[PDB]
Amino acid sequence: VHLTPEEKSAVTALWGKVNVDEVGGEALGRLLVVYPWTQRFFESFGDLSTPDAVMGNPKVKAHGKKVLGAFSDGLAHLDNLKGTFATLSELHCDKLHVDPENFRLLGNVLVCVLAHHFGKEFTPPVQAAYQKVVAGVANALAHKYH
Amino acid sequence: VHLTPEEKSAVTALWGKVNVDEVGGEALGRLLVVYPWTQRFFESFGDLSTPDAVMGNPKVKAHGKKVLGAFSDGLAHLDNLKGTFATLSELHCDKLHVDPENFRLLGNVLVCVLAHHFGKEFTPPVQAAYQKVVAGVANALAHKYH
Amino acid sequence: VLSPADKTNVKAAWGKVGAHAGEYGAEALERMFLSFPTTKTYFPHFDLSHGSAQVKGHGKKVADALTNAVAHVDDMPNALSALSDLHAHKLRVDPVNFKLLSHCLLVTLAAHLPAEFTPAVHASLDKFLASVSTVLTSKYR
Amino acid sequence: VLSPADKTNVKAAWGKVGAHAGEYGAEALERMFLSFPTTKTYFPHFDLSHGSAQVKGHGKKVADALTNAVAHVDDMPNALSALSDLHAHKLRVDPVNFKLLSHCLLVTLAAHLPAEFTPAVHASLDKFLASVSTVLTSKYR
Ligand code: HEM
Ligand code: HEM
Ligand code: HNI
Numbered sequence: 001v002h003l004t005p006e007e008k009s010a011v012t013a014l015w016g017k018v019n020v021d022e023v024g025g026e027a028l029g030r031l032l033v034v035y036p037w038t039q040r041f042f043e044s045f046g047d048l049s050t051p052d053a054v055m056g057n058p059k060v061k062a063h064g065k066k067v068l069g070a071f072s073d074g075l076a077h078l079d080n081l082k083g084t085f086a087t088l089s090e091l092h093c094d095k096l097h098v099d100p101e102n103f104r105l106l107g108n109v110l111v112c113v114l115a116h117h118f119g120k121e122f123t124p125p126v127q128a129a130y131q132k133v134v135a136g137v138a139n140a141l142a143h144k145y146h
Numbered sequence: 147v148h149l150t151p152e153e154k155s156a157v158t159a160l161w162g163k164v165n166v167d168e169v170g171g172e173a174l175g176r177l178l179v180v181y182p183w184t185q186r187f188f189e190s191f192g193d194l195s196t197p198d199a200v201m202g203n204p205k206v207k208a209h210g211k212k213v214l215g216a217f218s219d220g221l222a223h224l225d226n227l228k229g230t231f232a233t234l235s236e237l238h239c240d241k242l243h244v245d246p247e248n249f250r251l252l253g254n255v256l257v258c259v260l261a262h263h264f265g266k267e268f269t270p271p272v273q274a275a276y277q278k279v280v281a282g283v284a285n286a287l288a289h290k291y292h
Numbered sequence: 293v294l295s296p297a298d299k300t301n302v303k304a305a306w307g308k309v310g311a312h313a314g315e316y317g318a319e320a321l322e323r324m325f326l327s328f329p330t331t332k333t334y335f336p337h338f339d340l341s342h343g344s345a346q347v348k349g350h351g352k353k354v355a356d357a358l359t360n361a362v363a364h365v366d367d368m369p370n371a372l373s374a375l376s377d378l379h380a381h382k383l384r385v386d387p388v389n390f391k392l393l394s395h396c397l398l399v400t401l402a403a404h405l406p407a408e409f410t411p412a413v414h415a416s417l418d419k420f421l422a423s424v425s426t427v428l429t430s431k432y433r
Numbered sequence: 434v435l436s437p438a439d440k441t442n443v444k445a446a447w448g449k450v451g452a453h454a455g456e457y458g459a460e461a462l463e464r465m466f467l468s469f470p471t472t473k474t475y476f477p478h479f480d481l482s483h484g485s486a487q488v489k490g491h492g493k494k495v496a497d498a499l500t501n502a503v504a505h506v507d508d509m510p511n512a513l514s515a516l517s518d519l520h521a522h523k524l525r526v527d528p529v530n531f532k533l534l535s536h537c538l539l540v541t542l543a544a545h546l547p548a549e550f551t552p553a554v555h556a557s558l559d560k561f562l563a564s565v566s567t568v569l570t571s572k573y574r
């Protein structure tokens with residue numbers, strides 16, 4: 001799961017340029033647009049009927065900030081992702097009943113959002129590093145399911 | 147994964163009754179029949195044209211025995227599957243060029259073969275423990291890929 | 293695509309199952325919940341206790357749907373249309389879980405068909421369950 | 434199934450790709466080999482390092498196949514028939530890998546289409562690549 005020192009530096013360098021609130025809203029919104037069954041957890045968020053209704057949904061945006069905020073905090077602990085996300089894993093299983101496949105889908109959408117935002121700066125080696133990260137985070141969030 | 151003492155007990159108890167020769171031949175043979183693209187690694191094994199030809203193929207049966215023998219040995223390392231399969235992981239990656247998805251397919255076929263042989267004795271809890279094992283072995287064999 | 297040989301194998305195997313189908317449907321669900329606990333995230337509203345009448349009732353529904361699909365194996369998209377609508381739009385079960393239930397149905401059949409579960413029939417049943425899963429996920433997006 | 438809007442979106446996006454299709458195909462392959470090392474098991478005869486002539490050449494072939502799929506978006510099972518046979522019977526690439534190349538194609542498009550890669554177009558392209566993948570794995574068994 002782990003990254004080379006070169007990959008850790010690449011992840012940190014790119015992330016330093018990321019507006020986490022904005023990228024978070026964008027990633028969660030795109031998840032709900034591209035994989036619309038993921039809307040099943042968000043009936044209380046109101047209008048999700050069109051791509052614009054989803055992307056501009058204030059509750060979608062607010063939740064995206066929260067989700068990617070936790071993701072961002074986790075980048076400081078790449079050596080212990082399972083520990084880092086243990087309590088959120090338990091919560092998503094026991095209270096929220098969220099299929100962990102959702103974490104994998106969000107990871108892939110996030111990689112697409114980073115590519116879209118950064119263009120050529122999101123090089124193939126930078127992507128490879130981030131693929132390790134989102135797989136690690138999704139596996140960590142899945143780890144305490146039972 | 148990580149087996150509980152109760153799950154470890156269930157795995158070992160059933161395995162003590164397993165004819166590794168038969169189950170190995172059956173598992174590899176059924177892999178090649180049910181997912182015939184897996185035959186790509188075994189052109190040297192000769193006749194694989196029909197299900198009966200595959201199942202009765204001496205080289206398929208010999209390899210099935212060898213593979214399940216290494217699987218069997220791994221059961222003595224349930225808390226360190228990655229360590230014990232590290233050498234074979236590198237071998238399958240660099241020398242044999244075997245997509246690790248094959249390990250996952252074989253694991254599920256093995257579970258089917260065990261159910262077919264043991265019938266009602268292959269209870270849902272026994273299956274659940276064996277699902278942990280075959281996932282663990284597949285993940286261990288995939289772990290050193292690069 | 294399900295070959296004519298596949299269809300013959302599936303019909304013969306499910307024919308042998310007969311009135312046990314409902315029981316096997318419940319067993320497959322129980323096997324799935326135990327073996328693949330993430331699938332329980334779709335049933336938090338269920339009673340999942342041992343011998344759960346709710347799970348048994350649901351296994352019967354799953355089995356009946358499969359029985360109908362076998363009976364209409366030449367025209368499954370039409371036979372499973374409403375059920376496909378339900379999973380795609382109401383339930384919104386992630387498509388990855390259909391392989392998990394399919395595997396558990398296959399394991400259940402293997403455990404109950406010692407004579408019939410030949411390699412060829414194993415293959416046909418796996419293809420059949422994948423085809424059912426394909427139809428049931430065809431309207432998701 | 435691809436909707437009318439999906440097909441409009443795919444045609445527009447691939448149109449904007451234009452003469453860069455081959456470049457992007459090669460880039461997507463490189464992204465795949467780096468991000469998902471297991472996919473390298475299918476190319477042991479290839480130079481897979483950065484700047485590989487083999488990968489550049491193969492990217493063109495992949496791109497040309499996608500261009501043809503776009504041109505025949507309502508008949509991909511037939512337009513891609515030979516390619517499906519090739520992957521199913523000669524190459525025997527495990528079906529799980531198609532999602533990996535599809536994702537890397539998506540990422541490549543995202544990296545090159547700032548204006549065009551809207552959420553709706555993203556959705557349509559993902560559906561399109563999944564449909565191509567489904568066709569290419571339809572003859573495996
Ligand atoms: C071969 C695949 C499947 C078949 C044949 C099948 C069949 C059915 C049937 C017949 C129903 C009841 C329909 C009705 O009440 O009108 C149902 C409901 C349901 N299914 Fe499936 N299903 C399949 C796959 C799945 C999977 C993989 C999951 C999740 C892991 C799932 C989760 C559900 C849920 C949550 C319900 C609603 C239960 C309730 O609250 O009543 N299904 N399914
Ligand atoms: C969108 C999905 C895909 C498309 C459009 C595609 C397209 C193609 C094309 C056009 C060719 C050359 C055909 C010919 O030589 O006549 C080819 C060959 C090949 N493909 Fe794919 N492919 C796809 C997916 C994959 C995946 C996922 C893999 C493995 C990870 C793969 C592995 C190969 C291999 C090994 C060859 C042969 C290369 C050689 O030795 O020359 N393909 N593919
Ligand atoms: C598609 C579903 C889904 C995904 C992919 C997802 C992915 C993630 C990821 C992945 C990187 C992270 C770090 C994360 C973190 C969080 N999620 Ni997730 N969550 C999801 C569905 C939820 C739901 C639902 C809630 C509760 C929302 C609410 O209504 O309050 C939630 C709540 C949270 C909270 C707030 C916890 C609380 O209320 O005590 C955090 C933090 N999360 N979520």
Ligand code: HNI
Nearest residue numbers: 184187209212213214216217234238242244248249252283
């Ligand atoms: C579908 C392909 C495939 C699968 C699923 C698979 C799954 C596994 C599993 C899973 C439980 C184990 C424990 C395992 C172990 C082994 N394999 Ni695998 N192998 C596979 C393809 C091979 C091939 C190919 C060889 C070389 C065979 C030969 O005879 O040359 C091989 C060789 C071996 C050997 C002999 C190595 C040596 O020469 O020293 C062992 C041991 N293995 N294989």
